[PDB]
Amino acid sequence: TPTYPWRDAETGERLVCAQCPPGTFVQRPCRRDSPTTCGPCPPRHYTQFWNYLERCRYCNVLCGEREEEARACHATHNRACRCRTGFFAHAGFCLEHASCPPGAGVIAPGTPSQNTQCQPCPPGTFSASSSSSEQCQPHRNCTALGLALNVPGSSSHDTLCTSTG
Amino acid sequence: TPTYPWRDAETGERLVCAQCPPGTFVQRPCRRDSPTTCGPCPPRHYTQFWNYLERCRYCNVLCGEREEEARACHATHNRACRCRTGFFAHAGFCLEHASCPPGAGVIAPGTPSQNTQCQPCPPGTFSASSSSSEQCQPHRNCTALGLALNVPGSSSHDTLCTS
Amino acid sequence: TPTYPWRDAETGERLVCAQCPPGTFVQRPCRRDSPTTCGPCPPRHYTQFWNYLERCRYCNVLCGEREEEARACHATHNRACRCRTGFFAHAGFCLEHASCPPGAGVIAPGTPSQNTQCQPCPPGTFSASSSSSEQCQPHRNCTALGLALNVPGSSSHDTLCTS
Amino acid sequence: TPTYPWRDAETGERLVCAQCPPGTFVQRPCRRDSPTTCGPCPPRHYTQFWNYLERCRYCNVLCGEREEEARACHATHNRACRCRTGFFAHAGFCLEHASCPPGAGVIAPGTPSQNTQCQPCPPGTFSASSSSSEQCQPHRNCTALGLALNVPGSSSHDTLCTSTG
Amino acid sequence: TPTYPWRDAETGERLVCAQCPPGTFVQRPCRRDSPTTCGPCPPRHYTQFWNYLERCRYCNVLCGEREEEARACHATHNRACRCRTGFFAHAGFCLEHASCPPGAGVIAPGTPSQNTQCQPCPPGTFSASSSSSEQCQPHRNCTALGLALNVPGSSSHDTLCTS
Amino acid sequence: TPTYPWRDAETGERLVCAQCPPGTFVQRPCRRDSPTTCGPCPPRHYTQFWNYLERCRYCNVLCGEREEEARACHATHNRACRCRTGFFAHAGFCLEHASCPPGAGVIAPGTPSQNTQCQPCPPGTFSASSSSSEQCQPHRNCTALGLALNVPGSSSHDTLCTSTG
Amino acid sequence: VNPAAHLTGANSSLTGSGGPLLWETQLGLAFLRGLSYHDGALVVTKAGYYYIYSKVQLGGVGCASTITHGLYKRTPRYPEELELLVSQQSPCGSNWFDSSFLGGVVHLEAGEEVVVRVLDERLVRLRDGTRSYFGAFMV
Amino acid sequence: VNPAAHLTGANSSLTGSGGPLLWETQLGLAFLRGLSYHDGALVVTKAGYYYIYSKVQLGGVGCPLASTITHGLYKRTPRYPEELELLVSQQSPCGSNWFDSSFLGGVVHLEAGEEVVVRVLDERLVRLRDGTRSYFGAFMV
Amino acid sequence: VNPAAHLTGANSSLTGSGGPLLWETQLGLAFLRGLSYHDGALVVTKAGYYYIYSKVQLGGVGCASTITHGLYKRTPRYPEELELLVSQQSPCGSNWFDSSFLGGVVHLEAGEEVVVRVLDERLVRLRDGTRSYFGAFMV
Amino acid sequence: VNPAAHLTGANSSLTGSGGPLLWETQLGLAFLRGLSYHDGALVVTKAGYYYIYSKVQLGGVGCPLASTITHGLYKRTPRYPEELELLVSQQSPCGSNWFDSSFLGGVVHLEAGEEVVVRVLDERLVRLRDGTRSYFGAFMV
Amino acid sequence: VNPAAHLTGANSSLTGSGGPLLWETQLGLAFLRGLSYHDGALVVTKAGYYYIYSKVQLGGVGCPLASTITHGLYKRTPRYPEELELLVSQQSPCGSNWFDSSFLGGVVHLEAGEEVVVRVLDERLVRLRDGTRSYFGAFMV
Amino acid sequence: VNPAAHLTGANSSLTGSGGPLLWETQLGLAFLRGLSYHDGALVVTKAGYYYIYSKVQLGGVGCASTITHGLYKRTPRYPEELELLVSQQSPCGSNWFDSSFLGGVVHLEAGEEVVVRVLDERLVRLRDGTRSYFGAFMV
């Protein structure tokens, strides 16, 4: 249990007072016969460590329109923010999740920390839309369907078959 | 087993020949009597799907100095490339993995498709180095060591304690 | 009525034929005996000037999503385009009309050829809004209302008065 | 007529003094028996509203080399600037009026508030010069002139005719 | 005197003809009997090296408004260009020579290949002008004139002295 | 010898004291009967002119990693920096000397004040490398060597001859 | 009679579908001589080596920000397109224009088709059939 | 007691009204000593010369060409129905995403009852984070 | 004998007049085979389909800031030029270079002329007849 | 009486001479209290530590590559025939038309008779508007 | 005696340790009057409100996208094992070679024994020249 | 039988030597019909006028910063290359792509060779034989 020096005001003896734990602060210092009085941190304030503050640190962190509370102001921790759904964090900003264009598909959806991840559509697959969730899907397989090939596909348009063979 | 139309080259009636499977092509089309004859792809060539090509497709893909074969040429597929260790794919280029500067740490390591992801070190933690692997570590806990505080820590420096 | 030179296709002497007027073209050239015969332009085609074309010019101009026909195809002219309401023509593109930010007001509204023009609100005036129409208005006159001044105004906020 | 509170210095009675009108300021406050003495604003100063300043606001506005006085310092109004001829106002600067290149013509000359306005030359018209005043002019009309066409025109060069027909 | 292979145009045995010197070309190839005949380059043409061309190379190089002929067309060389006085060569363009702003002076003047070089005026020196020739001069020495100091100097203003 | 006014502290007479020369400062002012005592500038300080400082100016100039001392701190002059070898001075920075690409050659090597100077290789010469010292060199001359021409040269590759003629 | 063709940008050229571009084949400067057309493809009927070409005019405002413009073959012998000639441009480097031109000789058999694609199609600007086009001739 | 104050960026700082910014006056680092506050204005209670200052942290994604940001300190007096500009910066800092910071300090004479406020046009470019990046203060000299 | 031609950039190529560019027709790489030339225009004398082409080299310093490069037909049957193939580039995005290439097949009759224009002409940089040129051949 | 001053941008501010800027000293917001002024220099009459400050508003159209602007506060003493640099910024703010603002503050010790001036190279990039955007002041601490 | 200090950029300023910057405290323009210093921190010996300030001169060649520079003033107290942010700027000034300058001033209350330090991330972009371009000071108000 | 050829970008195309680019001549879309090849050059064996062409795909990260792409003739009659058709581009104006296309008709004799150069070669990006290529046909 860590300590801070003090002095009885009546006598003058050195004291070794106890510090206050996370979630509290020093409301009254120790005396010869009573220990340090630790107060609970009042709303909107905090202390996250063992400490001897005469007042708690303020929850100073503000969340923008594009952010929500990853953590609330609590007596043991400041508030903290992450980006809302639809957005990710680049360089202190919350940017919109990119869409993958036609010809390319999502390999990882975007998160609060990470942007949409796109590769170009590998052979035999396609994406025809700009989308931030559409993945490269496999071409209509005319031979598996027993049908005749009408127009071959590409990375951005599905293969077309006839309706017979 | 799918099929394609063919005229006999001298008789000229519609025949219905079988296609050739992936890894092969039409060495010789079908006729009156005999089925389609399918040869295998020569080296450096491919057919990924069922087909009636008279010549396999060429494995035309080239990997650059910062790429390696994610798939080799094969009878049934072209070569494909991904970035080497150290680089990631951004706009059809292999860029170097980022370093996270002091005061910020690695949450996700770089990979062939994704850059190193970083963040500010939250309270009670630090990173004192630009690095593409080093993460936000927690401050030395002076109290949990039976020591007094010397100099407080920051997002880029460890808290110090005294004897 | 102007004219053009022509050889007769079998006789080969210089004839001097009449051209065809705007909205028409030469269906059949003149000969020994008969004047030039002029047909009218088919749909989607034009001739704006006097001419001896064997086929009208095609109305080749295309209007984009942010454009409307400032002139339709007609026998005597091509189509032309201008920007739709909301956009103006800058470098062959239709850009959106600007908004004037707070502390500044509209002097000239946007049009198909010109962007919204703005200025700082001069003394004694205000605009509290980003807007592509809202202009610099004068401050509330506390004295001309038999009221005392509460909070003074600025280029972006109206002066306030008390009861 | 708006008012400001005051107090006779001899007696102590509350007074309701008159404010000074645009073009003046309070030189002497009112007293029990005389009204407020309004002074005329001295050169280089002004008051534009009813007021009780002990001194006029200064005409602080400065005009750059590219500007001239839209309004002079006057006792009822600060000085104000607009751009000189040749120039227009974009974003607090005075920029030079653009020229329209060859192939394009002036539809509106530039003003202090507005830049030159150009369209591309419509069919049957032209401009051959970079100019900030030359408009799209109509092509020499060879049929109206009774002359033979020599070389057709374009948006940037005039039609040429021969000298006969 | 080097040589080239030639077939005789009717006999067809390998002959070994002499090339033509710079400033000339092959008016007529060698044969059974006679040496190669070399004509001189017509105007506006050249051959810089020994050759067997049937036509001289054209002096194809053009100098622009900001360039002058560093070498004229000649029988033995093409034209070449350098920048006019006032400009220097940067990326195949002739840019204007720079001015050194106040507080800095010229150490090397501009030339056709090099821009004006500048530097901050060191202590005890000044330049009060933007100029592409004016250099860092030393401050007036008030003491070496039997005068007292009035106002001290700077990198952009001369030191002043009193009577 | 320039002077500064002073006053004897005992009597009160005006004095005309001597200033101190470059490399010194006033340690003691003059008196009626002794001249001004000039002290030598202590390490890391300087005076470059005649002067009456009570202390020398500090050698405040710092040299970056890309710089070395053009001049040392000396009692008569501040320190001064130029760029190290490999680097030149543009706009208060020390930039790396450019290399001339293939097809171009050094006409002047780079200095502390000046960047590498390149022209494009004139006819009959070449450079095949990016280099900050390689100059346009003349093509292998096959006729001077008595050998047959194999492949002609260019501004970026040397002419090749056979090994005979 | 040597096959040749030149198709021009048209009102319906951008379908927004991921498919090839469509073109005008008959009016104005557009024409077909010994080649056919079908839902955006030149269709070959005489086998041979062809110089093929295309130019697209591109434009926009500001900036996935790479544009591919390519010519691609279809054969009914294989269920996927073959890339023939391709460019990547990133010209957004407010307003911007840039043009992309492709030309090259390829061997085509009777029945094979060539088409043009641009990703993202959104960036193609039509004006009048002269800035975006697609053509070929046998050589 | 020499007057001083330092007011910090807060959740309600950006009203969008075209009025001046609001600030925190009591919590964390914010304080008033011999100055008062009202609707974003510091309110002078002791006549004299003050150094006033303000920093605002700006940032965005690209520019809208309206791409000039003004930051300024303005005085209000009850004797004149208009504000007086005191100290003002124009920045066009967006020359993808960007951050810039604008500082203003200077000394002005202020009478009791006069007020000072801080305006940024366009307000939407100010980025609040934690009270340490945008702020407004003064002290008497 | 199949008509063909290639004209090269020349000293006199930029007249500054708003007219077409002029070219060299005889010296160096320039030539005419079954086509004629006249104050900057190729003049056709054998009717047919022609692949026409042009490349201009562009350059400057900094930045009305859009450049058109185009090929245009004249016929004496109509008193205005017809646009055939055109590009807009805005490449000033200190020093800069950019090249514009146009090619396409068009039908030309005996007597019709083709020319090249650039607006603004000021931005064309001549060097040696290899960077700006204009040509055609029948197909 | 604690010395203070605040001098404002004025019509004659930019001499073009290579000398320091000139300022207004009496009108509108400009004032001297226990400091004097002479040819653009503030002139110290009471020895002590001063916080000095200056802001200049810069702007232009494009850059001339000479594209670095220095803004600085410089001291003059009669004991040494050269100026001493005190506080200095370099900005290259032009990275069409642009605006940037440069602020400088700090404490220095000044003797009676010493002077402080403000230099901007290149002077032509300073934009005067109304006395609130470029300025020069000090007060004793 | 009213406390004041002004510390200047020096050869050892950039430690690279992730710690705060170091400064000169005695030579040329640097001084301490009623403040102390220790390992880059100003150390308060007299409780009260201080205006603290810092300028750092930044510059480089291009950006590394890590292209945001933070400059800040941070408080240390012995009662809590973490630093408190006081005043902070973010700049992305590199929008070839560039220079920008960041200034910070404001008033904070400081007790005896508390300390203030200056951090720049990333430190490598700070350009020292002569002690006049990067600096750190304070004085009591 | 009309000479024609189309060579494609290949693995070995950038030698780094200052020499011309090399190409594939046989596999995939590459072919030779009445022309030959030799250490990067098309070699002519039938004299005539040829349309020649090349396209190189360029790319990089940031920025000597001018790129030349050119077609050049060799004849054994003269010990230096002749420039035929050339472009300068400065497209670095982080990632970037740009494509350069050159085409033009030149007269070539039996024995003459054409090659392609790019300075700096480093900036050429190969992908699959469709973005950088070199070809010709007689006209």
Ligand SMILES: *[C@@H]1O[C@H](CO)[C@@H](O[C@@H]2O[C@H](CO)[C@@H](O[C@@H]3O[C@H](CO)[C@@H](O)[C@H](O[C@H]4O[C@H](CO)[C@@H](O)[C@H](O)[C@@H]4O)[C@@H]3O)[C@H](O)[C@H]2NC(C)=O)[C@H](O)[C@H]1NC(C)=O
């Ligand atoms: C439509 O459906 C049919 C199914 O009816 C499908 O045919 C299959 O295609 C796949 C892909 O070409 C074939 O898979 C290959 O099989 C051979 C062995 O027979 C393997 O050698 C192949 O190679 C693998 O080898 C590498 C090791 O060096 C591995 O790294 C890599 O994973 C390779 O894939 C491969 O597995 C399969 O044989 C046929 N199936 C049949 C029954 O013929 C066709 O592809 C579908 N078409 C479309 C257009 O989607």
Ligand SMILES: *[C@@H]1O[C@H](CO)[C@@H](O[C@@H]2O[C@H](CO)[C@@H](O[C@@H]3O[C@H](CO)[C@@H](O)[C@H](O[C@H]4O[C@H](CO)[C@@H](O)[C@H](O)[C@@H]4O)[C@@H]3O)[C@H](O)[C@H]2NC(C)=O)[C@H](O)[C@H]1NC(C)=O
């Ligand atoms: C040289 O001079 C001759 C005059 O001798 C001139 O001929 C004229 O051209 C104009 C423009 O083509 C013609 O005007 C048209 O007339 C017809 C009716 O005859 C109208 O239908 C036309 O269309 C209008 O209709 C639209 C409604 O849907 C309107 O919105 C729009 O305004 C259209 O213009 C148009 O008015 C005119 O008929 C001829 N005149 C004669 C006498 O033939 C020629 O154009 C001049 N040439 C050059 C090169 O400048």
Ligand SMILES: *[C@@H]1O[C@H](CO)[C@@H](O[C@@H]2O[C@H](CO)[C@@H](O)[C@H](O)[C@H]2NC(C)=O)[C@H](O)[C@H]1NC(C)=O
């Ligand atoms: C540092 O170490 C001490 C362990 O000795 C931690 O002490 C505990 O902190 C938690 C936090 O909520 C309290 O609930 C407990 O009361 C603490 N200890 C005891 C004895 O009960 C302290 O939290 C640690 N600090 C950290 C992890 O930041």
Ligand SMILES: *[C@@H]1O[C@H](CO)[C@@H](O[C@@H]2O[C@H](CO)[C@@H](O)[C@H](O)[C@H]2NC(C)=O)[C@H](O)[C@H]1NC(C)=O
């Ligand atoms: C506000 O309203 C009052 C009207 O009651 C205006 O009073 C006049 O102001 C003009 C300005 O030159 C004076 O000449 C007149 O003397 C005023 N009133 C009277 C009673 O004579 C005042 O100007 C208005 N303020 C404005 C328009 O800004």
Ligand SMILES: *[C@@H]1O[C@H](CO)[C@@H](O[C@@H]2O[C@H](CO)[C@@H](O)[C@H](O)[C@H]2NC(C)=O)[C@H](O)[C@H]1NC(C)=O
């Ligand atoms: C200014 O002029 C005087 C000449 O009257 C110079 O005086 C000499 O300065 C040098 C510098 O090292 C000293 O060693 C000499 O002692 C000086 N003079 C005498 C009388 O001995 C002075 O240096 C000049 N200042 C300059 C060039 O900056």
Ligand SMILES: [Mg+2]
């Ligand atoms: Mg997609």
Ligand SMILES: [Mg+2]
């Ligand atoms: Mg780190």
Ligand SMILES: [Mg+2]
């Ligand atoms: Mg508004």
Ligand SMILES: [Mg+2]
């Ligand atoms: Mg014009």
Ligand SMILES: [Mg+2]
């Ligand atoms: Mg100078």
Ligand SMILES: [Mg+2]
């Ligand atoms: Mg070299």
